[PDB]
Amino acid sequence: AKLVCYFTNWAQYRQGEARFLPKDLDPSLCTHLIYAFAGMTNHQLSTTEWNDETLYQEFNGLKKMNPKLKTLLAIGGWNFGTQKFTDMVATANNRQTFVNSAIRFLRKYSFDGLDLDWEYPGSQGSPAVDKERFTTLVQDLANAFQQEAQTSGKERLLLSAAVPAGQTYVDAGYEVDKIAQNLDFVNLMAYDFHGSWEKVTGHNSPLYKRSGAAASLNVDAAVQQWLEKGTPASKLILGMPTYGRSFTLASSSDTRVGAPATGSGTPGPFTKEGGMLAYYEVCSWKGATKQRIQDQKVPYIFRDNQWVGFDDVESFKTKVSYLKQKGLGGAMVWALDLDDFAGFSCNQGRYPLIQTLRQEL
Structure with a gap:
């Protein structure tokens, strides 16, 4: 099983005991740690915070203590928008500029892979043609990752993508069955189902439905959708908030x-x-x-x-149990800095929630 956890590079600005830097990371807690987020300058992969190079080094430096730990760099995010992804995967020469920069950049800072967080291709401003191109991007990266493998003598760079749960957003930009072949794993964002953007209270991450499309805003409906569309359960990792x-x-x-x-x-x-x-x-x-x-x-x-x-300890226990039953590849978490990482507030020790995921997995 996999326990994928998202590190957040702006969490370092939270006041007092909420402040979160790489030193607050538990190297054996998760099997995979993903760093959010990387940016893009001239179609190339770039940093977004003044100390990213320094943070990257402590981040991946954790592998010295735990050689099993795998790290990936996540590019994109909500704030990042879609505009720059469109211009990058526009042609082929530019994609090469990116893929070749990604490779140099990941290897430079000792990352084991790249997590694609385009939010979202073929939607919210992204043209309908970005759907097919996204998979091309996936492909080109997987392909270069293959070739880079021989020349470097290091393990093939990993490639994953964070994906939406709703039917609308999937159709608009995800050729599931096809991308699922080149992606080492899929981090399903099974949360943000209900929010203050609604005139009625609703739960952020309900396992099951309470009719219509409304009855599709729950973990189960999200899992089912990605499964039926060709995602092998092994590759499906369940996001937990x-x-x-x-x-x-x-x-x-x-x-x-x-x-x-x-x-x-x-x-x-x-x-x-x-x-x-x-x-x-x-x-x-x-x-x-x-x-x-x-x-x-x-x-x-x-x-x-x-x-x-x-979500509390009990909900997580239930979700892992659910995940086990659907035969999923493991659990994904957003985010390390949102859990009581230093056991400074909840009296449940360090990482109450995430340590629960570790225990049950």
């Missing part, structure tokens, strides 16, 4: 799922973003009421006019 989606309730009385909400929930004191909250900002809510949505096997907690749907 160490964070919750928050809502401000229209009325402190009516804390039901589906209850009305005026907007995003109060930004977290450490994460500073409405709609989302790290586990260490929820795990120990003083004077709140934690409940459990039986049909979706996930919990939610409210206090006053604040409502939050998050």
